[PDB]
Amino acid sequence: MNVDFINPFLDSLLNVLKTMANMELKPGKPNLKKDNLAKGDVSGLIGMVGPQTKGSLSITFEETLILEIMNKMLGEKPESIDEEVTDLVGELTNMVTGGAKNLLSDKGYEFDMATPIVVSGKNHTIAHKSDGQKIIMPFSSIYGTAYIEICFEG
Template sequence: MKVEYLNPFLDASRSVIQELGLGRATVGKIEIAPNPHGSGGLLSMIGITGRLTGRVLYDMNESTAINIAGVMMGETLPELTQMARSAIGEFTNMISGNAATILKERGFAVDITPPTVITGGQMTLTDFGEMNVTLVVPLILNKGVVTVNLAIKEAHKHGG
């Protein structure tokens, strides 16, 4: 997977995080994994189609999700409610939508699917088809850590 696919997600993440009043995001150590892992307790998964194909997963623990959703909703949340999960879906949708816009500006026209938010611990997703590399990037916020798992590649070209 090319780094040029990752940078739009990092740029979009920083921008959305700052716009929402979540402070600044610092990029932690980038790792390569064969499959995306969700160990935090909440995953938001978004599909990518078009010139590039694959998925991006945003992984965070419940406390981070509650903190981010609380800022987005303008209130202190005691627990991870359905509305808070919906806010996290919107948070990750905003990042992915902005990344898709950046990718399009760079010649990679893509669409994104609506987010699927999953809760639970220690998840490993193995349904990534031909994806054999996932970039794992922790974004460190003052509200917690959001780990971006990015597995995308250039789509096969078809004649026509």
């Protein structure tokens, strides 16, 4: 996959966490050829469609990380992933994906995003089922790890 397409999602993530949670996550080594390995506790998932193109984005969080994000964004920690946390994950998925859509639209890449889906489950794995090009990127802090996966056809 081309880097100028990938970066805006990676940059939106870091920008959203920086401006909203005063949090600088550390990007790790990307994986360009295998998903359904990295475990998470809550995930935001969103589909994308463009002219002759289709794709998908997922942002997966370990429980300790998302609860600390809640704590910085709303001043209080819920103890466990509850309904309000799933809403935060939905909103974060929208901000990461929307911020990427604006930057990419200036570069000539146009797409519409679907409704986000939040999955809650202890140690679930995500797999983007497509013959397209994929990228998985870990982002770590002392409070846990987040995984962003972007997939596209066309």
